[PDB]
Design a protein around this nucleic acid. Sequence first.
RNA 1: CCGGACGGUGGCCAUGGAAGUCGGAAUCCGCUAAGGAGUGUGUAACAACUCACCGGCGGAGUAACUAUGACUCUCGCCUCGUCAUCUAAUUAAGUCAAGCGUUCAUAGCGACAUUGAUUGUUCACCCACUGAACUUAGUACGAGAGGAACAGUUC
Lengths: 199, 136, 191, 152
Amino acid sequence: MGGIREKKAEYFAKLREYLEEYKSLFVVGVDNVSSQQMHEVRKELRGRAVVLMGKNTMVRRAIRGFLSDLPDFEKLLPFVKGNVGFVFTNEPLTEIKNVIVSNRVAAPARAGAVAPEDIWVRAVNTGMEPGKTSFFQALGVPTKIARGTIEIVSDVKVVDAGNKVGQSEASLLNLLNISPFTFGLTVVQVYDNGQVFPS
Amino acid sequence: SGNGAQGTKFRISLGLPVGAIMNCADNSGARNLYIIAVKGSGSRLNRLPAASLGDMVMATVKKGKPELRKKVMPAIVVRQAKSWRRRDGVFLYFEDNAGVIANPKGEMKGSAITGPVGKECADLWPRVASNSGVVV
Amino acid sequence: MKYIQTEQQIEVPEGVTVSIKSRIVKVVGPRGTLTKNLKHIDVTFTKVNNQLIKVAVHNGGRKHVAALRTVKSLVDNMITGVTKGYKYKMRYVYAHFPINVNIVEKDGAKFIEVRNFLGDKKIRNVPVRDGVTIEFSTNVKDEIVLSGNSVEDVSQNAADLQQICRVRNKDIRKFLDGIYVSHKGFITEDL
Amino acid sequence: IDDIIDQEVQHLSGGELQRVAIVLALGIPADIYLIDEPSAYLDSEQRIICSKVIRRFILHNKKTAFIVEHDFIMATYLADKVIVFEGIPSKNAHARAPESLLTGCNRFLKNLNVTFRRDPNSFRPRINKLDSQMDKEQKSSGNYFFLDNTGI
RNA sequence: CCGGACGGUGGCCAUGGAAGUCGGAAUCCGCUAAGGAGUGUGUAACAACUCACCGGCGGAGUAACUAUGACUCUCGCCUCGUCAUCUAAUUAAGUCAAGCGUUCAUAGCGACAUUGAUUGUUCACCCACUGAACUUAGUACGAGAGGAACAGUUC
């Protein structure tokens, strides 16, 4: 916890040898995914070959590149985004994506997050007794009281992909028990053998 | 005045300072009322508190049933004698000083009131209205 | 310890020109125009380029320098108010007695008239300031909306109203009646 | 009503249904509210609960209300103006513009010819018999009712 | 400003129930960028918040009862008395923070330590009164118990 490194140039130095040891290098997104979910996802990778560290200490692929003859500089626009890791692997490119991208860990949306895909809510009885039905109506979910229970009138899209989910919107959906997205290591890039693959 | 007095009261000449004795004019068994305090009266060095028509006092019974004597209770002044003046311009006065024993809320202890009763008191204390014959 | 210079940037945008002589600022934009007097401070404004203006203090103490950012901010909100403009929303709050709010006018007036507040036998009035307009929001319940070019006039007009409805002689945590400011933003949408 | 909540309206009672209906009209916001004969099927306490209801909400909300009534006391409490109807029943009829409480009450009570002097204790209307000197005196004054107001 | 705050496990004994968070010591392991056998907020008891730490950003004895003392033995102060009686009435400032405060040191407090009767009556002690009353309103808040005001009105 104290001041002692918290290393600089030392952890970079371990990291240096790690791009060079493995053929295939991935630029990946934790941000969304819980850590029982990440930590489990990482368990899979770890048997096969392993993931290591950085900030901008990550962006220093250049030093690694400088040791060999491979990229600089030369890359398209260094794709790194908030919340990035590097996955160093034996595992060929195509398979790594199918493990990570296909098998994501369940999870519910969040308030103030941009929806990744279209959100819908179904029609049918919520099962909930009379109360503040109004809250549902505020979002643009039609509801009315039928049989002394709150029911949603119809299926409709509450939010589209690429629009943000409002704070009210999220909370009300969670009470419904409606979630739906796939969380995991969102692949943002690949290097293998002098070649750059985007998502 | 105070509790149970629904209505306000326009000032009327103070007739009865502390120590004054009025006739008891109910059928409670009390023969007279000796005034020891006026409710709602203020303070000035040396001034006796003094009551008037429809004031609630605190009295003891000097003459009357022994079950009423030796203690302090509320009463209400019903007839005056010191002449006073109404807003119709009139200076008027009764032949006696008299009031009736009553409870803090303003309920008569007795059931009749013997003699007349000035309207300003009647107007002030409903249970006094009830038991009054000739008013004013 | 006295800092030899500290400066700030006031960025200028496409639709506005701001002009300063002595320390009198005139900002003029799409939404109309705003001017404020900065003589009470001692800073040096300097134009670098139609989209940029600096403000600086030479050899200042803590407190002087502290006032320098606040000059930047003050002239920023003049600039934004002349572009995006300012909109404060307030909502009525009451447990029993419905607060009824109007707009009356005696002698070119404009006042915000508050009736019935907590049953309150008195009729409350807050004058509408100039440069500020009032809409009772359609589509929303007991929402009043104050807008205009000057954050300072909108904000204060707002607070005048909320403060005219303070409660007395009651537990103010149980008796929460009032008109509170509920949203601070801009007039032009998307932003 | 908690117990009434499950019960059907067909299954319901008269007076209970009445208070519920009056309340329902007040349930929704409106610039103007219209109520017709709220006193039906109700006893003393029940009507008077209604009287407080209409006056308080209207005052507060600053909305207007028209109430039709047969009950003397209910009209007095709620209203500020009155419309009196006249003519012959089941034949024709007529309505008037709204007029002040004193004015409207004199007209209505003049049609009946019963004065309701005042009882000093109760402050209640006290009825006056036909041909009389005391009642005759009133007819010359134009006072059918009395309240805590100035008047002879 | 914000994201992440994780597995051994709800550590161990004390355990009524104590799963990090009243308590007795002990401080490990794996994780991985960093995640304390766990800073404070804890529902009883997990959670659910949080934060650290990665990161995006002149004196005595005596009792088939207490007390008193028939008996044996030895050389007007206190007082405004108590009970009646006559009265409606009666002498006729701060620091420190260990503690309380049921949970919490400072809401509220803080040890230690430290910087008309009656009387000459003053006084004292009663008997009464009253800023009050009225509507606002038995209302708002409250399971009730209870209980407001601003406005207007009269004193």
